[PDB]
Design a protein around this ligand. Structure first.
Ligand SMILES: [Ca+2]
Ligand SMILES: [Ca+2]
Ligand SMILES: [Ca+2]
Ligand SMILES: [Ca+2]
Lengths: 718, 718
């Protein structure tokens, strides 16, 4: 039989003598506050623990612990501090666990101090029962795993007060944030789907693609290759253009405006919901003023400076971390270069002779994804090490600086390839007269046949379906199970079957995955619609996956209380700040929309647009290729290749200045920057406007706190 | 002899019978709370009033009135609510006045209700003594007028706790805001002066102006006139260019970056100082929750909807006010058009024969200033009427909506001419082949000989020295004195010499003048340096002028307490938001700096720049002027005018396309928009960064409130 405990420990069953001395000096240091026993098994021991009501209301009143009462204004029971209980056990296991952890943190000998020194190896509360077993009696964990964590309740709201009461305000806050996230992605998903469907409706009726592969024109192009390539029909590469019309139309600009508006209204709506939850749960946010615990390395550094008697070394390791950030930027770009150069001279030595020319970039970004996964792991480790060497004075400051540094590193090495593809792909390439060669060795970069917006779109597609939806979830399932198999290959009481679980690392990784998701959603939505749909599917898996990870594998967290979400809301605000200018730069420099508008309203000469590809595509006297970097096999699929047509808005070779920058390039560049100006400033004003209209504090919650405080003093006077 | 009263009234000494009935029903409604008498003079009466300590601590404890004590942590005495007094009169006159006004507002029969209905005509507390008279005994008003309001103490700090204690937290907050304003304008003034001095050092050594009036080149220009003008040497108009080099150099961009940084650091520094003042004074900001008073028209509208049983009519009058705002925009532009067309055909009928060509624009903007002064008055009146018809439910909501509407109207009609001059002056003008004519009547607009940046700079100069420094201060002195002379032409006790003063209208006009000042300072600083200097002079007059206006003419205010400055900080944040994009547009489209950089780094052909004016200035076959709109007297001051040189970056007439837009215009336009992108985004990031670095809450003030609350409960337990 097993009674009702609150917290546990782990001694190691048998210098080490002084370790045992502290190992029995700390429990007798707390034994005049609490009560504890010791458990028995031949290879694994433990230290049980029991709270006493002599002490639990005493240290409960030590803080403003605000607990429920017996009076009710309008079916909404109030919450006083402590006056009368008449049950003596109406404190839940979560409250008992956080209060005994409060006592354990109060005694120092600081439980985490010696727990990090390694004289013990565990400190965890107890889960309540088994998840859907034999003759179980409907405890909180069983009902939670039934109605919340099952994959069959993916289409229903989550019991948020239940996950609060069983897990902690922080875990309840994370899951309610995910709920509001998915509920806000639903309409953005529907609008992305209808934008893509409008593109699918107008793709067979638009002008510039049906003429980009109108046949019987026999027009050629110029090889974007290195040395060993051939001229190729522009009409032979219109699968890419006819697919890119789905990703670029006058509706994607509408969806980008709507999506920046959606990001602002989501941040406002979750500020409203977070204030609502902070009212409904514990309200007050008066925490301790850096007075609870200091770090042991902090304290011995203060002892060192006392005995020897730093303050700018935080800034020195900050510029160290910025150099590491620029290091990671350049590493991400060169890793993408290596990955897109994973098939260099693929025709000579392997002689594949299949030549789909769609698969090489797929394998390229797959290798890129694998290397950035490994780099995500090593950057998380080095961010932990850098935040440890930063020596922050508190624990929350350590967590905040670690979160900021790890997010900056993960943002850098998860967005450098997409930045390089969407913006810097075919900019710095020269003309067919001369290109740019690194080390005077080979041509540096080349964009895609049919627009490397398609490279951007397939990269985003399989980085939302090949890393987020599949790889991240499969690793999140497998790494716990692989760790449990490596512990299995290398009836029982609750405090031991709880020990056979893996410890709770933090909410930082789940927050980080979801914020990188949010960056992928709101940062590159302009060229790529239905990215809300991929995020909706990933999150409709992710909420129940995290629920299973909490109630089925993870041992019980400490249930720490928190009002804010942390720095993650400021990080959301930063990503929503960057979203408008990156959508602007995508629409201008990538979407190939401003050149279409410029042609339509400057070089029309007919009314609507026609011959836009003949307007864009320049010409080139093919006898100007330098030093034998010509096409190594001029095949003459046509009668003879006389002029190759590359699109750069340059002057034709039958002019006085040949291969010079024409007026049209400066015209489209000026109008592109004009659209960045107009779009960025207009949607920034619209974002601040929809922030200003929607009130931060809920009107209903202000009414509830008004009537609640009114009745509080009206019942306090009598 | 005169005893110590707190508040006054005014009955009218002799329907009107019911008026007298309410006139003696209201004082007997309050007489079981307070004590009052009645005064005597043959033509003017009054109603005196006296508080009693039976009642004043009673309603003082009714609110969290926080008063000083007898204990002190480290020469900083604490502030409890009410426990022990042992003096019975340590409440100041300000506290007694605001508490008797609290009682008067509590009784409704709402003192302002019947005061607005007009059964009384005054409600004001009593000033303390005479300002530097005969045998006065150094009261608060006398010491205040001596050491604060004198013009001889303009170079010393202001007694801020003294003006707090004598006037109110709101008036103390306004004057401390002005103090921090001038203290922040001092370094911006010094940097503006050194930027102007650098311009004065490099003006005789720069390239483009010394060649703009290098002689012995005999170059001509093309008349920017209507019909009756002549060609004119470009070297004859270099006073304008040699003066515009002072206002445009590579240092004005530095000063614009520094000034946006200054605006952000000023807002942050005043947030710090406002939190410091809110700690040092009354701290808590828990006001009443819309429960103190409702408006009488609000209440009778609720009676109307009760008897008949609107909510969107606030939005209907809001779009009405937006139509009025666009009305005021177009009115300001057409008023500037009328003012700059105040001398139309000035040579034919008057035959001035002086022709300085610098004075017509001066008289133009003078007429513009007079008409916008009259429009400022009528817009203030119509904003009061629109906010009254908006029917806000509270009084603070009425003041806030009135402030926002009046500021939007004053911003519109005080910045539309400067916007039209700095941006839209010479844009929509065509070429000498064809211009644009309204109604096919006459040419619409023309820019200045030598750049209408000089028009902008003289307009800003005499709108900071001819409206702010001179006209506003002289009207602020005279209108009180003119009202006192119109009351004089159409010994005594304190409650009557106080009645011979003019009532306190509000702090909204002084706030409004200073915020329009701040807009002039931070919105158009890029082209115009040393505008901080003009603001420093205006404010170094303005603080002592407002101090004299308070302690010498204005009757004593009610001394209302407030934590925030109001919506004026949000308005400062909005102006600082607009400042970066308007500085960007000034530097690009007005400063003539991006064309110089574009010439230097694209069309150099020599190294440094030379012949920039010959690069900018196009040509025009003078036989192409249409329909006899040629120069009406081609004087041939040279040998013969063959080609007139206008600057539009257009193609010369000896090309295939003549008078077509050249490549250079699109090049300089693209680079202008690139600089707007770079400057706006970079300095917006720098503004948010210098917001993030400086903490909002002062670290010292957090220490003080920490030790204060610690000792509060440590003395409360015992
Ligand atoms: Ca996932
Ligand atoms: Ca995850
Ligand atoms: Ca003034
Ligand atoms: Ca003034």
């Amino acid at each position: 039989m097993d009674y009702h405990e609150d917290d546990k420990r782990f001694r190691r069953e048998e210098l080490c003598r002084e370790a045992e001395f502290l190992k029995l000096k700390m429990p007798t240091k707390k034994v005049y506050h609490i009560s504890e026993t010791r458990g028995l098994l031949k290879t694994i021991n433990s230290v049980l623990q029991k709270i006493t009501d002599p002490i639990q209301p005493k240290v409960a009143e030590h803080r403003p612990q605000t607990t429920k009462r017996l009076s009710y204004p309008f079916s909404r029971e109030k919450q006083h501090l402590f006056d009368l209980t008449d049950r003596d056990s109406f404190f839940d296991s979560k409250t008992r666990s956080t209060i005994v952890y409060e006592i354990l943190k109060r005694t120092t000998c600081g439980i985490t101090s010696l727990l990090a020194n390694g004289v013990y190896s565990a400190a965890y509360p107890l889960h309540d029962g088994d998840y859907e077993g034999d003759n179980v009696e409907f405890n909180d964990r069983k009902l939670l795993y039934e109605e919340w964590a099952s994959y069959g309740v993916f289409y229903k709201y989550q019991p948020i007060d239940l996950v609060r009461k069983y897990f902690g305000e922080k875990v309840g806050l994370y899951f309610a944030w995910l709920g509001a996230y998915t509920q806000m992605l639903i309409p953005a998903s529907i609008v992305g789907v209808i934008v893509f469907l409008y593109g699918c409706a107008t793709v067979d009726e638009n002008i510039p693609s049906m003429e980009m592969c109108d046949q019987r024109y026999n027009i050629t192009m110029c090889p974007l290759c290195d040395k060993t390539c051939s001229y190729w029909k522009m009409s032979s590469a219109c699968a890419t253009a006819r697919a890119s019309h789905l990703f670029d139309n006058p509706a994607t600009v509408f969806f980008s405006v709507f999506m920046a508006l959606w990001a602002a209204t989501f941040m406002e709506h979750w500020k409203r919901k977070q204030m609502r939850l902070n009212y409904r749960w514990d309200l007050t946010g008066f925490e301790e003023e850096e007075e609870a615990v200091k770090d042991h390395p902090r304290a011995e550094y203060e002892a060192r400076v006392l005995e020897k008697s730093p303050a700018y070394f935080t800034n020195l390791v900050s510029i160290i971390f910025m150099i590491a950030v620029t290091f990671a930027i350049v590493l991400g770009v060169i890793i993408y270069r290596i990955s897109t150069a994973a098939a260099l001279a693929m025709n000579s030595s392997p002689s594949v002779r299949s030549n789909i020319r769609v698969t090489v970039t797929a394998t390229a970004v797959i290798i890129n994804l694998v290397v950035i996964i490994l780099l995500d792991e090593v950057y998380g480790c080095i961010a932990r090490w850098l935040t440890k060497i930063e020596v922050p004075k508190t624990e929350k400051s350590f967590e905040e600086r670690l979160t900021f540094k790890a997010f900056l590193l993960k943002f850098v090495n998860s967005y450098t390839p997409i930045f390089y593809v969407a913006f810097f792909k075919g900019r710095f390439v020269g003309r067919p007269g001369d290109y740019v060669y690194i080390f005077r060795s080979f041509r540096m970069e080349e964009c895609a046949p049919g627009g490397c917006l398609m490279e951007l779109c397939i990269q985003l597609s399989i980085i939302m379906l090949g890393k987020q939806l599949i790889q991240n979830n499969l690793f999140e399932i497998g790494i716990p199970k692989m760790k449990k198999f490596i512990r299995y290959l290398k009836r029982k009481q609750r405090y031991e079957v709880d020990f056979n679980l893996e410890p709770f690392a933090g909410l930082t990784p789940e927050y980080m995955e979801m914020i990188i998701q949010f960056g992928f959603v709101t940062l590159f939505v302009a060229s790529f619609p239905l990215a809300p749909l991929f995020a909706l599917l990933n999150n409709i898996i992710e909420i129940r996956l995290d629920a299973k990870k909490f109630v089925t594998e993870l041992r019980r967290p400490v249930a720490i209380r928190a009002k804010d979400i942390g720095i993650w809301y400021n990080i959301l605000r930063g990503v929503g700040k960057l979203a408008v200018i990156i959508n602007a730069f995508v629409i201008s420099f990538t979407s190939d929309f401003i050149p279409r508008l410029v042609y339509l309203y400057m070089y029309s000469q007919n009314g609507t647009m026609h011959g836009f590809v003949n307007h864009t595509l320049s010409s080139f006297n093919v006898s100007d290729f330098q030093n034998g970097t010509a096409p190594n096999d001029p095949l003459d699929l046509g009668y003879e290749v006389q002029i190759c047509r590359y699109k750069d808005y340059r002057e034709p070779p039958w002019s006085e200045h040949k291969y010079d920058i024409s007026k049209d390039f400066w015209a489209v560049l000026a109008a592109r920057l004009a659209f960045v100006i107009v779009f960025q400033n207009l949607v920034m004003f619209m974002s601040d406007f929809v922030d200003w209209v929607i009130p931060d504090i809920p009107k209903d919650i202000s009414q509830q706190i008004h009537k609640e405080k009114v009745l509080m003093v009206e019942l306090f006077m009598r």
